[PDB]
Amino acid sequence: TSKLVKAHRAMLNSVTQEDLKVDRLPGADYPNPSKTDYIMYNPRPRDEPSSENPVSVSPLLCELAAARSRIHFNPTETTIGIVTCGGICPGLNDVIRSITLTGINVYNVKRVIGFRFGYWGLSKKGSQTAIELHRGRVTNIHHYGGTILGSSRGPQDPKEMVDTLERLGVNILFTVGGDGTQRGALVISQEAKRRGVDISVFGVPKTIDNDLSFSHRTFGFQTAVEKAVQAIRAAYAEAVSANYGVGVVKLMGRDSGFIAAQAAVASAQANICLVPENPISEQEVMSLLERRFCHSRSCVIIVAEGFGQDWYDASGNKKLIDIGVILTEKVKAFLKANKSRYPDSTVKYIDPSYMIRACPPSANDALFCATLATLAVHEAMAGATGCIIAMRHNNYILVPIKVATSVRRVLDLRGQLWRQVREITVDLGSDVRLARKLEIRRELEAINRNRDRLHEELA
Amino acid sequence: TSKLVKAHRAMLNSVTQEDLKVDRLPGADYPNPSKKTDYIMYNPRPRDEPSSENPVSVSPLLCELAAARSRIHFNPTETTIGIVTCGGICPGLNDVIRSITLTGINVYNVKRVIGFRFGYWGLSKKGSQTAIELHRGRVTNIHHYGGTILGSSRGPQDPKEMVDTLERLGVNILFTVGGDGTQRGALVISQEAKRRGVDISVFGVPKTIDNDLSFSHRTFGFQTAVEKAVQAIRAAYAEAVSANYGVGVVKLMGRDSGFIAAQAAVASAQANICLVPENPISEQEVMSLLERRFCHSRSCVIIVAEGFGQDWLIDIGVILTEKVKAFLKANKSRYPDSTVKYIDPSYMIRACPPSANDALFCATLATLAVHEAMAGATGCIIAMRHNNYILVPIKVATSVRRVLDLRGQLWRQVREITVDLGSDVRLARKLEIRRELEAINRNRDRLHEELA
Amino acid sequence: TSKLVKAHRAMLNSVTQEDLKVDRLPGADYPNPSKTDYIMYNPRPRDEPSSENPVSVSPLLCELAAARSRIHFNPTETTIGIVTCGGICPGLNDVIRSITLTGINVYNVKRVIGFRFGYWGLSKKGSQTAIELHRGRVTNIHHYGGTILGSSRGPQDPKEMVDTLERLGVNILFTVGGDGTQRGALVISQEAKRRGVDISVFGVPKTIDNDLSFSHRTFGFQTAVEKAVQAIRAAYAEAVSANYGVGVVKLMGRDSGFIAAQAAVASAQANICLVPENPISEQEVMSLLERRFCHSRSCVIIVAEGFGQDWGRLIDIGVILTEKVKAFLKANKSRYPDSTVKYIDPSYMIRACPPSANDALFCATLATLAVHEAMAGATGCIIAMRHNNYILVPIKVATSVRRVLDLRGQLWRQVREITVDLGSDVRLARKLEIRRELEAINRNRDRLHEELA
Amino acid sequence: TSKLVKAHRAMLNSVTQEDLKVDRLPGADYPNPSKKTDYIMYNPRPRDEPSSENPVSVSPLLCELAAARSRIHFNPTETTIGIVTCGGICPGLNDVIRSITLTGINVYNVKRVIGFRFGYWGLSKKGSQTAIELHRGRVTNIHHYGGTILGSSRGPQDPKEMVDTLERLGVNILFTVGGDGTQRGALVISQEAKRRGVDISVFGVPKTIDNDLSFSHRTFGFQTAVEKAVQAIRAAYAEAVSANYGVGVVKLMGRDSGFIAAQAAVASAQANICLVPENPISEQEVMSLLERRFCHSRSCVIIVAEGFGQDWGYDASGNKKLIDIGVILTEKVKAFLKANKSRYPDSTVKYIDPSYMIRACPPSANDALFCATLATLAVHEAMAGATGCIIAMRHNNYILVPIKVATSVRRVLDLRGQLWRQVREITVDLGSDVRLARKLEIRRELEAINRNRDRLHEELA
Ligand SMILES: Clc1ccc(Cn2ccnc2)cc1Cl
Ligand SMILES: Clc1ccc(Cn2ccnc2)cc1Cl
């Protein structure tokens, strides 16, 4: 294929144009109380600019998401279900709210059910806990972080859940969660189709890491970066205030390190940036720290939680070793070994994970959540199922779950972002004597200029 | 015929593929002390249905991708870079200054970087005296602050005077950070310096908060502007809600667009009326929407773009404010006690550092602008389209401008939350209290149950 | 009488110890389901530290506010009323919430009524709009600015309002507003006592200007400063970006200029600071601006809304001062050729916002104590903060005097410290400046030379 | 001892009026280049009721007010000022550095200002080499940032070495920005420099975020710390609420006090349990409060001061040697919930150490102004020959406290005071019942809602 990595429980070994076909629940009878279009996967041309229009490098076309002239489900007779799974994430309530109010205010659906604490709230034993989502209940939930429905990790019995959906007359079930959640949602889809029950299962991709394939952005990412940067600023001030001071700060990234990268660059306070895409040895790290301490009394280390997972697997995804705490103790033991050279020295660990997830979204992420939701509803009412909504090239597209779980995104280590990271982070490939000379040369040239202009300012 | 408007002094009456060719200063001798031009389609939509072979763009237009080049035209250790910030301020102006400075110094190792004070006036013979050296030490933490250390000013100077100053200071590359007018001036400087046969690259960094730049989905400062706008709406709302028949008027940015007005209205979800230039309506149309709102609520919030109602360049905020006040003082009968609050948050929106996302965006826009100017790009701007960075000829970028698609999903989402006269108020208000009552009865039932 | 100013319709010409006696509704029968103490007005000693303990300069003693062993009203039989009057203010909802929940959760009162849009919500035609304040209704109101009850300026008929209080069985009415509100609340108090009706009227002082007498702090002030400072930072960046750029920024202060002062000092970006306490001429201002433009291309002017109220034909001193400066710079185009003047009214972003956590805690405490005291039969009085202690002040007193910047005080020192001084010869000052600048840069030069091998 | 606690190595067993006398360096020759000491009572509470004569303080103690003096002791244009920041960082450290610098330069026009790097180590022979010049240009915008440009370090140095460096650099005034350890060191330097008869003024700027300083209602950084704590609680709460039987443990500052824990708990109003050193309780007492909370809610938030429960797991450099009560309490709760899986089946426990986001940040504008004032006054008084003393804030006034006194006593939550009331008001009380008492509460909202229902039915018509 091209840019993407094969996921660990991939259902596809490649993606053909057929794989991108979005399952449509049979029928399209009722008019929207309010033809499918495509966009190219790759907008790069195959040839150089000749006489005729340009041609995509990739044969892949993606289905654009938008409110349909004809809808499949009958508005005033439909019941919408929502369930939030996994760890929390900025704007979870924003998705809940926009789904609720699009169903109520735009399609005028019969009712909206919010299932409590993830898939457990569709189990026979926790279907008792579900709640009614009227306007009054979601009025200001978007002003807050986490989820009013609550969440939980891991799966339930597909049969139990489809049982609860039928019993509550749920025509559309919106699965707000990560890879594992949407793979579960495909199981529910194939169970409800095994029974021939008219239910649409539709995924709203919840990943803060923004490692979603056929996606440039997922909701919560931008807010996560903003927060990460504020955590780095505190790590930096804590580290700078100490002689041979190290600040370790763990940012999100199991599979990607997009947060680690973008936050490192944006703060411009990152001296070392450890991401899963670029795995390096313990001694490689300590060597970068050693280099840094040649010329500065201060080092700041960004580490993605998915880095150095050799210094497993829960329910869907993978059990991480706490690389933050490991890396912290490794550095401490390295500095206690070279007390000779780095006499007084201090190492500070920061897990800002809680302040990053558990907060309302930036207005830009809030608007993005609102749009992702409203469109997901517009399409589920038009019989879309077994699919997610994502953002590519300024457009909203529908991706089959089977595809979206098969491939994942990952830093291009030859790309402009990672350039800008190496631009600011320690490079062993710089002679520190020669570099530091040419530095003070410029500093001196500049200060002598000011000296000259100040002499001039005497009457 | 697509989603662009032809600009007021457009230099092109159409755009052909030739018009998109980016001027390259002759020669490409020196190697990038760091380390074929590539394209992306204008329109990524296919002409046909998904058939056997790969899909084909609806539009014949191809855009030049911006990236660090294997071969550069200018000699690093012999080059001098010039920067000038023009017009009104904007979030992350200092971020662009800093990243240009430090990319030139730290990545290309240029001889020196000159910052011209207060816009084009700082290249005039009479203000070239005020220009400053941009060493690392001078730009260290400027990105943490709003406005511009160089300072800015509106309007033009003598092209000859400015090229004179560029030659005298040995400026090989001049980075013009400003709006439409600035970049049109920058093309004048380009054509003057080429009339003299002087090896200077003039390169534009588009400064518009309104995000109305053609061949662009995003301009630096926009996201931060939205974030701030939303915080101003939240204060307008709390001020209006606290009053019986309370109106909050809040003026957001938008001379030509109303992208801020729209996105902020939707994101806050506190906008009852949203006035933008793209949708001009009468005074009575406004007062009718306010009247409708006051049928069911004691509270109205009005978003107005500074470029709206320019037939009532005129302070529509203060006009609209007095119009509403005079309308409510007429109709005291119906709206007895009533209060109207004007808010100009313009100052808190422009004059502030960027959000981390806009900071990263500024940094990238800059670093790439340098990577391309060193590779002999001139008479062009850098913009963001479809997740990619592209080089657009100034002649093109000034010929068309962006504008809200009133049939597009964003404006849908605005009408979704703002007063609609086209809704029967009796029928709507009924179906409202029906749901309210259903919900109340549910809670009632569960509370009755709570006898353990 | 010394450091305070006499208010414009003061009910007292001085304050005696008797004037400070806080009206107690007769009876104290029921136990708190949960002796009055004093603090000195002035804690300064009359004499030196001699053999015996020190003695206050002032004879005045203030009643400390705290939960009483015995309360006057019967908890499960009491109804509490709240009304927010005037302009909004950070933490209005915080006061509403803490009063509500102290009455409910601590005293377990029968019910709590919130009267809509200020005194209008106690008028016969408006009492229909009042609302029930259960826990569920005030749960998260403190996260927001302005008032869920809503507010309105001006008075109503005292008789109409006492009529509504009796009809709704309101035993305690909490008046959240400024001077005018509490003077109205005393009228209601004296009307309800003219009828012999067992109602306690208790004031929670709402002033952002913090010009309340017998008070060092009022709720909303700290938050106001924080916001003011953020407005100055934008004014500054707007002004700096222009050649001969002026930023005018109007902060709160009708009678005081405490916000103007504290914000000027805290930002340290204020070049001129105009406050009502120090009224100066138009030409005095333009002279300070002129001085500033001798050495800098940038001036930032803090103006209190109550300054220069004699410049007009409150008058909008922000807009006046703005046009005056513009006309002065257009007159001296010769000297200040290109020049720009930017006005900023951040008034809306300052009032209409939730409180800083420190102001939220302060609101919570002001409220909870106001309830603890009203249940113990306190009436015709306000609660304020003096010298780290909470005290009860008779409204008659609190409306008679107001606070005001001490222009010889350390704060105003720190303002003059950073704002243009005409009393500096600019030639001699600017010399001694570049001397230090050069000394400093030569030092760095020396240390950089050292860093080479 | 009456309201205050005796500190662990207190230099006084009581405070008399003589103990409050602020050491004045002999002489007061030069005029303040800027154009008789006043007192305030310790306790402003009267002994008797309001009778015929003026009221009399309960306490005989009078405190010296701090303010710019008509006559100063040191010669401005001939004086050198020294600054050193010690210990852990704190909001507005740079604000104190800046205001001291610029008051000395701009107001007194002192000869020079030296900033000693990384605490007392920067006065040691071996680190005196690292000290820096503090000109206007160097402190211009440092106040916009957290931590210290000078840098800091814990622990002591040789008093002789440090006085050696002070004499060699001609430092007339040394400003010690640190905690009570730092100021006790500063008294050692004071008594060493007086043993040599060297005209040096040692003046303390109290750096405690915990706000446990005696003869002080406020220390710089406190308000900002609260603000930040509250934002950490809000994230702890949202993380806990999103889980079925979800616990959020959040460690706030408080080695000796728990003022942050208390004020943050009350202000957030999201705290279900609040553990502070002043009120030590058993492991089972905690788990019992959690158990109670889980009877009625699926969500618990626990505020723990770092100085609480220091007997669940002596004394190295400073006061003690703290066990990580955050991590202990976290594992204890986890093991308790894993034991009662029966009752609390699915359950989640989240630990949060927001310590770094609280210290390492610039001050709130209110704390910035407070830092600026503390500094400018400290300079105004050191120039007027004040030494062996700190500046603090009491009853809206700035006072000078002898270090010997300030290190002898410390503040601590009054557990019968209105603040701690307001904490118990919102935190789990075992003295509400299972059902028979714990019942009367679930009323109100239902009674209210039928009224609104009725009026909404009416709005047909
Ligand atoms: Cl919501 C979601 C998130 C990520 C992915 C692909 N992926 C990324 C990392 N591991 C799998 C797929 C989906 Cl459906
Ligand atoms: Cl910097 C810039 C800003 C806006 C536009 C398009 N335009 C023209 C007039 N209004 C918007 C073009 C450019 Cl090049």
Author numbering:
A (entry chain B): 10 to 43, 55 to 331, 338 to 485
B (entry chain A): 10 to 44, 55 to 331, 346 to 485
C (entry chain D): 10 to 43, 55 to 333, 346 to 485
D (entry chain C): 10 to 44, 55 to 332, 338 to 485
Could you share sentences copied from the article?
In this stage of its life cycle, the parasite mitochondrion is highly compromised and cannot carry out oxidative phosphorylation and T. brucei exclusively uses glycolysis as the sole source of ATP. Trypanosomatid PFKs have been characterised by X-ray crystallography and two conformational states have been identified that fit with a classical description of an allosteric enzyme that transitions from an inactive T-state conformation to an active R-state conformation. Comparison of the T-state and R-state structures show that activation of TbPFK requires a large movement of the critical catalytic residues Asp229 and Asp231. The carboxyl groups of the two Asp residues hydrogen bond with the F6P substrate and also coordinate a catalytic magnesium ion, facilitating transfer of a phosphoryl group from ATP.
The X-ray structure of this complex shows that the di-substituted phenyl group fills a deep allosteric pocket adjacent to the active site, and explains the ubiquitous presence of the dichlorophenyl pharmacophore in hits from the HTS run. Based on the X-ray structure of CTCB-12, a number of derivatives were synthesised using pyrazole and bicyclic scaffolds, including imidazopyridines, pyrazolopyridines, thienopyridines and pyrrolopyridines, and tested against an enzyme inhibition assay and an in vitro parasite killing assay. Over 30 X-ray structures of TbPFK complexed with ligands from most of the different scaffold families have been determined, and all show the conserved binding of the dichlorophenyl group locked in the allosteric pocket as observed in the structure with CTCB-12.
